[PDB]
Structure 1
Amino acid sequence: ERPTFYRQELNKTIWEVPERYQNLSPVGSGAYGSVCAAFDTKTGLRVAVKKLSRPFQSIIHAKRTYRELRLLKHMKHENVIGLLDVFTPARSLEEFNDVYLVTHLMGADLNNIVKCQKLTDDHVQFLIYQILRGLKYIHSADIIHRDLKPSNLAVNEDCELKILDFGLARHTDDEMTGYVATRWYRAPEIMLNWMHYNQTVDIWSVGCIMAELLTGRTLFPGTDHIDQLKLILRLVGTPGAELLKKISSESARNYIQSLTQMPKMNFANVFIGANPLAVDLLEKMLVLDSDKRITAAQALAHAYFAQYHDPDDEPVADPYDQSFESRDLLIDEWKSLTYDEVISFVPPP
C-alpha cells in the first residue's frame, strides 16, 4: 500500500518522501553523501535519510546503487548499520529514478568522540569490543569494509556503536593524497597495492583506531603514502623474507627492499601507561603480514574484552550471495534488479 509522499527542496534538489518522515535536516556536512536527519513519526525513531545521487546515470553508478541496497538489506546486527526503510516516489519501473535509504541516526561519529571526550580504558574496551563484534558479523558474510575509520563509526549517548560504509570501497587518488585521515587507517598492503588483499585489512584499521582511543593521537599520521609507510615500519619493523615473497607487486617489493632494515619496536614503550592487555592486543592486530593478524572472532575472545565477551551473543551473518559482483549487466538491468529489491523490502520488527 503506497504511502502519500510530500516534496521539499533540500541539498539543492527536490526530496520527495513519505509523510511519516518529518523535520528533514541536512547532516554530515557532505561527508556521508546526501543525508538528512529526520523524525520517523511511525516508529518514534530519529533516522538518517540518504537520497542517492543520480543512481542510474552509468553502469558504474547503477551497479553501486544495487550494491549499496543489497548490502543494507542483508545486514541485521546491533553493531552494523542496517536498513529501516527504502523508498521511491516512482509508481512503476519506467518512472523509477531515485532511491532513498533510511537507517538509524546516531548522535555522533567516533571522530567527534575521541576529539571531545576523555576515554577511559573501559570506554576503549566497550567501543573496540563493539567494532570487532560488528566486524565478525560483516567478515562472516565475506564482506570487507576496506575503509574503516573513526568517521564511519556512528555512536549514541550510551557509547553504543554501529559500523557504516562497509563494502562500498571508493576514493580518488587526490582524496588519498597528503596529510589526510582518509589514508591513516589503511593497511599498508592496500595503501601500496602489495597484493590481492582480503578482510584482514580491516583488523589493521581497528589497531589504528584502538591506539588512537588509548592515546588520543593518530597512530600513523603520514604526510603522504611514503611518509606513512615509514611511520608504520618504524613501529612494526620492516618486512622479513616470508612477507616479501608474498608481495606480488614486483615494483612494490623492489622499493620496500631499498629501505634500511628496522626491528619491531617495544609496544609497552610506545604505549606508556596502557593496560598490558590492550598492548598485547595491539601487537596482535598491528602485524605487517596480513596472514598473521588476529581475526575479529579471535580478538573477541582476547582477555582485554573479558568484561564484554559473550560467545552466545556474537552472531554471524546469513549467507550473502554476491555473485552479482562478477556480473556485467546493462544500466537498465542493474536498475531492474534494484527496483525488485526496493519493492520486496520488508521492514524490521
Structure 2
Amino acid sequence: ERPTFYRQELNKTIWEVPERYQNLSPVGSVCAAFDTKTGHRVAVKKLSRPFQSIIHAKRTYRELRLLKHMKHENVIGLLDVFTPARSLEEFNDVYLVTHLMGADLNNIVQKLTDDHVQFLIYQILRGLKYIHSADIIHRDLKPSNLAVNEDCELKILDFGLARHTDDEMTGYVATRWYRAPEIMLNWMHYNQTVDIWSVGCIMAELLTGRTLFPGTDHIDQLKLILRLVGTPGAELLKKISSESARNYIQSLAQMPKMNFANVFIGANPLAVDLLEKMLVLDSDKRITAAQALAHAYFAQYHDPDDEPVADPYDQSFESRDLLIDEWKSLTYDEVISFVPPP
C-alpha cells in the first residue's frame, strides 16, 4: 500500500514525503530527518531537475542503479527511494534516503596513531575490493568523500558519475590533488587502478598531516608526482596514446624514483612498503585492493572470511541511446521495485 504523504516548504523548496519521515531540517537539496520506521537519523535528498535533458535523465538513472546495488558495511547504501507521483504520467520528482553522515575524513584529520591509519586505510580497501569486484570505478576518492564516525568507522560515498567539469579541476584545488596522472592528463583509457593511486595519496596525508601532491595546476602537479616516483621509461611511454603528451614527457629531464623512507621519515616500515606498491606510475603494475588487504601492514585487521565481494552489476545501459522519456520510464520502474534492507 502507498504511504500517506505530507507537504511543506523548506528554504524555498516544496518537499512532499511519507509520514514516517519527521522533523526535517536543511543540511539536489538535502534535509536531515528522523525515520520513525527504523529509528535512525537519515539524510533525505530531493533531486534537482532530474529529467531536464537526455544527459541529466541518464545520470539520474545511473545514480539510482548504483545506489540500489551497493550493499556493504564500508560503502554508502540506500535505505529508501520514493516519489509522490501516483502514475508514470505525473512522475517528476525523485527522493533518496540514506543514513545521516556527520564528519568526513577532513573533520577527523586530531593526532592519528599508526593504529588509526591502519584501521582507516583497511576499511577503504575493504570497500574498494567490493566496488571493484562489480567492475565499478569510483574515480573521485578524496577525504571529503569518506565519512567517519566517533568509533573510526568509515564509509565511501559520492561515486564519480562522470560529473566533474573543467573549471572544477583548474588551479590550486583539492578536487585534482588525489587524481591519478593518466586520468588527470588524459594519457590513456583508464581502469580501476586509478582508485589505488588515490588511496596512496590519502594514506600519505594521514601519515604526514600534509597533502602529498598539492599542485598549483595540472603541470605543477605532474612535476611534483614525477619528482617522487621518477620519470617514465620506454615501456610506459609506449602506452600513452597521445603523441602530443608523449612529446611533452620526453621534454623533461630524467629523474630517478626517490627513497620513500627519506620522504616519510619515521613511518612504520610496513606502511612505507605499501605506499611504494600503490604509488607506481605505470597503472598496470600497481597493487590491487584484494592484494593490499593481505599486506602485512593490516595483519591485525585482515580477515579473509569477512571481506565480501559484490553481486554482478549489469552496466549495459551505459552504451544505450534512449529518449528522455525512455530514461524516465526506466527510472520510474526502479523506484517502484525498490525493496528495503532487513
TM range (shorter): over 0.9
TM-score, with normalisation over the residues of structure 1? 0.96
Offset, 1:110: 0.7
String of CA shifts for 1:252-311, please: whole Å, max 9, x gaps: 111111111111111001001111111110110000000000000000000010011000
3-state SS in 1 of match to 2:14: strand
Worse-superposed segment, 283-292 or 37-46: 37-46
Residues in 2 aligned to 1:37 and 1:215: alpha-carbon distance in whole angstroms: 34
Worse-superposed segment, 64-73 or 8-17: 8-17
**Any gaps of 5 or more consecutive residues in structure 1?**
28-32
Residues in 2 aligned to 1:167 and 1:123: alpha-carbon distance in whole angstroms: 27
Offset, 1:38: 1.5
Offset, 1:17: 1.2
Worse-superposed segment, 131-140 or 36-45: 36-45
Residues in 2 aligned to 1:261 and 1:46: alpha-carbon distance in whole angstroms: 54
Checking the alignment, whether the CA contact within 8 Å between 1:48 and 1:105 is kept in structure 2 is yes
Q: Name the counterpart of 2:24.
A: 24
1:336 counterpart (323, 326, 329): 329
3-state SS in 2 of match to 1:252: helix
Relative distance call for 1:169 and 1:159 in structure 2 (3 A) is farther
Checking the alignment, whether the CA contact within 8 Å between 1:71 and 1:167 is kept in structure 2 is no
String of CA shifts for 1:229-262, please: whole Å, max 9, x gaps: 0111111111111010001111111111111111
TM-score, with normalisation over the residues of structure 2? 0.98
Mapping for residues 187-336 of structure 1, pairs under 5 Å: 187-336=180-329
Residues in 2 aligned to 1:261 and 1:77: alpha-carbon distance in whole angstroms: 44
Residues in 2 aligned to 1:25 and 1:267: alpha-carbon distance in whole angstroms: 47
**Any gaps of 5 or more consecutive residues in structure 2?**
none
Residues in 1 aligned to 2:25 and 2:233: alpha-carbon distance in whole angstroms: 52
Relative distance call for 1:250 and 1:12 in structure 2 (3 A) is farther
Residues in 1 aligned to 2:303 and 2:86: alpha-carbon distance in whole angstroms: 46
3-state SS in 1 of match to 2:118: helix
Worse-superposed segment, 251-260 or 336-345: 251-260
Worse-superposed segment, 332-341 or 35-44: 35-44
String of CA shifts for 1:81-131, please: whole Å, max 9, x gaps: 1110001111111111111111111221112111xx111111111110000
Residues in 2 aligned to 1:302 and 1:123: alpha-carbon distance in whole angstroms: 16
Offset, 1:72: 0.5
Checking the alignment, whether the CA contact within 8 Å between 1:46 and 1:104 is kept in structure 2 is yes
Residues in 1 aligned to 2:224 and 2:336: alpha-carbon distance in whole angstroms: 49
- The runs of 4+ residues in structure 1 deviating greater than 4 Å are none
Offset, 1:167: 4.3
Relative distance call for 1:217 and 1:326 in structure 2 (3 A) is same
Checking the alignment, whether the CA contact within 8 Å between 1:107 and 1:157 is kept in structure 2 is no
2:57 counterpart (57, 62, 82): 62
Residues in 2 aligned to 1:295 and 1:15: alpha-carbon distance in whole angstroms: 43
Residues in 2 aligned to 1:95 and 1:202: alpha-carbon distance in whole angstroms: 40
String of CA shifts for 1:154-201, please: whole Å, max 9, x gaps: 111111111101241311111000110000000000000000000000
Checking the alignment, whether the CA contact within 8 Å between 1:34 and 1:50 is kept in structure 2 is yes
